[PDB]
Amino acid sequence: TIKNFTFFSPNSTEFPVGSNNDGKLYMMLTGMDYRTIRRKDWSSPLNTALNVQ
């Protein structure tokens, strides 16, 4: 069985794309496994006492 995702749905029900389907898709594009991340600090995190925001 073939599950198509990045394709047109004629009756708007044919190819619904889920969070796991897009999740797997995004992993393959960047080349990552379940042991690594993609992290970016847009604004430097603040450290107040024994806490990190």
Binding site: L46, N47, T48, A49, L50, N51
Partner: protein, 149 residues
């Protein structure tokens, strides 16, 4: 205090002014320039615990409260050196559920490890006054014991 002619230290009337030394009435200073600086958090009886809501002024500068005795000597002080300006520092001195937490927005931070441990010698507050270290505003609730009522 109000300014009164002849009673207060002023050079008034006929030029170039005049203030007379009398017996009893003489010259009494009206007040002090910028009397708004003087504020006293008077402690009249020995208190055992309190719930203060402290609003800090400057970040990275120790912020909190200090307590002085009848002779102007510090006996204890709850003070904290935080990295950023907390919206308020909620402190409870109650023994059973001691709380020293800082608040910024909707986030609650435990401020106990950032506190100055040397200055905080006692919980029992004695007769004297309280000072505000790096605080813009403060709200206090004092609980004092009575054996029989």
């Amino acid at each position: 205090g109000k300014v009164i002619a002849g009673m207060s230290k002023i050079y008034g009337g006929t030029a170039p002014g005049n203030y007379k030394y009398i017996k009893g009435t003489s010259y009494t200073y009206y007040g002090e320039s910028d009397i708004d600086r003087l504020s006293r958090w008077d402690i009249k009886e020995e208190i055992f615990s309190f719930m203060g809501i402290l609003y800090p002024k400057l970040p990275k500068t120790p912020a909190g409260v200090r307590f002085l005795d009848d002779i102007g000597n510090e006996y204890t002080a709850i003070v904290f050196k935080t990295e950023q300006v907390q919206d308020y520092i909620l402190i409870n001195t109650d023994v059973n559920d001691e709380t020293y937490q800082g608040w910024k927005g909707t986030t609650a931070l435990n401020l106990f490890p950032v506190m100055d441990f040397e200055r905080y010698r006692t919980r029992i507050i004695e007769k004297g006054q309280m000072e505000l270290i790096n605080l813009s505003k403060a709200e206090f609730k004092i609980k004092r014991k009575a054996d029989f009522v």
